[PDB]
């Protein structure tokens, strides 16, 4: 996997490739690694497909039960529930998750949760095997308070390079835009991004 989440002026955008592998075989070339845990709180999944699905399902259940009693949860709250699962079961989990959400008060927020189960709030985050190849690129090119179109281009160029060098990443580039307007899904195909 190659995944990332980037905060910007109007909110936050999540990005991901679509490759799932068993060794060098591509078990699924059109995977959806961007998953909803609440209306405007989503996550990027990397690591074990089984573990990250099991975790996301439990978090979705927790936030749904939270909403029934206490109303809409914060993005921080969602990241805390992910952390709690990842930290307390660190011995039996292989999950690298990036949590991203849009509040009206707090705007766009990104939290990353690596293997250990630690939490790190960041302006943007990258993760997955393919992220190694774009640390240099992303650090040089990221700016705070970018526009929607600039953030889309940043994520597209970044994941394009991650996909180009990482054999474990590929397929289409999926994206999810989180703003006050609502939720927008975007997709980008090889013929476009490969020749960037």
């Amino acid at each position: 996997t190659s995944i990332m989440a980037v905060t910007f002026k109007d909110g936050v955008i999540l990005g991901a490739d679509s490759r799932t592998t068993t060794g060098a075989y591509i078990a699924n070339r059109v995977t959806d690694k961007l998953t909803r845990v609440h209306d405007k709180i989503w996550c990027c999944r990397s690591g074990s497909a089984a573990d990250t699905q099991a975790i996301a399902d439990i978090v979705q259940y927790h936030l749904e039960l939270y909403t029934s009693q206490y109303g809409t949860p914060s993005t921080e709250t969602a990241a805390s529930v992910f952390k709690e699962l990842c930290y307390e079961n660190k011995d039996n989990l292989t999950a690298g998750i990036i949590v991203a959400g849009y509040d009206d008060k707090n705007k766009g927020e990104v939290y990353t949760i690596p293997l250990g189960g630690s939490v790190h709030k960041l302006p943007y985050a990258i993760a997955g095997s393919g992220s190694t190849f774009i640390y240099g690129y992303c650090d040089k090119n990221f700016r705070e308070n970018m526009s929607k179109e600039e953030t889309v281009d940043f994520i597209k160029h970044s994941l394009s390079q991650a996909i180009k060098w990482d054999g474990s990443s590929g397929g289409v580039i999926r994206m999810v835009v989180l703003t006050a307007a609502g939720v927008e899904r975007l997709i980008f195909y090889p013929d476009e991004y490969e020749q960037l």
Binding site: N28, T31, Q53
Partner: peptide, 20 residues
């Protein structure tokens, strides 16, 4: 569905030793 509990969605799928 795979043994470890992961699921996938698709229009066409194949599993088993002859899946390739």
């Amino acid at each position: 569905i795979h043994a470890h509990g992961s699921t996938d969605v698709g229009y066409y799928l194949s599993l088993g030793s002859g899946s390739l």
